[PDB]
Amino acid sequence: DAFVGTWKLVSSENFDDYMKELGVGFATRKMGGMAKPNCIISVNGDVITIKTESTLKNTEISFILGQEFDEVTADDRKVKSTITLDGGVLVQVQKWDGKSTTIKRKREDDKLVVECVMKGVTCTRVYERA
């Protein structure tokens, strides 16, 4: 399983615009923009865990594929999230207040590539094994 590992952010495109679309205020966008998180992905049986570690904020989710769960996001949104596997890509949708965002996690070569979309905005974040 190409996703298991500890992954360090190495590049990011359009993350500020994405955060704006999420409703994140300026001071918090400022901190989030300069963060270089680690993403730690593990699996045991049916249960996938994704841990994000950074100096300004840590988060953790554990989920079963196809099973909706409640999540509090890093920016404090209370969302309903569902994550499925579609041709080897982990696809997560977060829904709240009639809005939604999609986060796709893909393995490409040596990279974990994460594409985040909300409205017209597409952010791409690349991570490499720690």
Closest approach of ligand Q1I to the CB of residue 75, in Å? 4
Q: How far apart are CA 112 and CA 70, in angstroms?
A: 24
The binder of ligand Q1I chosen from 6, 42, 59, 124 (CB under 6 A): 59
C-beta separation of 112 from 15 below 8 A: no
The number of residues that bind ligand Q1I (CB under 6 A) is 20
**How many whole angstroms from its chain centre is CA 127?**
11
Residue facing ligand Q1I at closest CB distance: 32
C-beta separation of 82 from 92 below 8 A: yes
**Straight-line distance from the first to the last Cα atom of the chain, in angstroms, rounded to the nearest whole number:** 17
Closest approach of ligand Q1I to the CB of residue 92, in Å? 8
- 3-state DSSP call for residue 14? coil
Residue 117, annotated ligand binder? no
Binding track over 23-42 against ligand Q1I, x by CB under 6 A:
-x---x---x--x-x-x---
Q: How many CB atoms are closer than 10 A to CB 102?
A: 13
91 binds ligand Q1I (CB under 6 A): no
Residue numbering of the annotated binding site for a fatty acid: 125-127
Per CB under 6 A, residues contacting ligand Q1I are 9, 19, 24, 28, 32, 35, 37, 39, 52, 54, 56-57, 59, 73-75, 103, 114, 116, 125
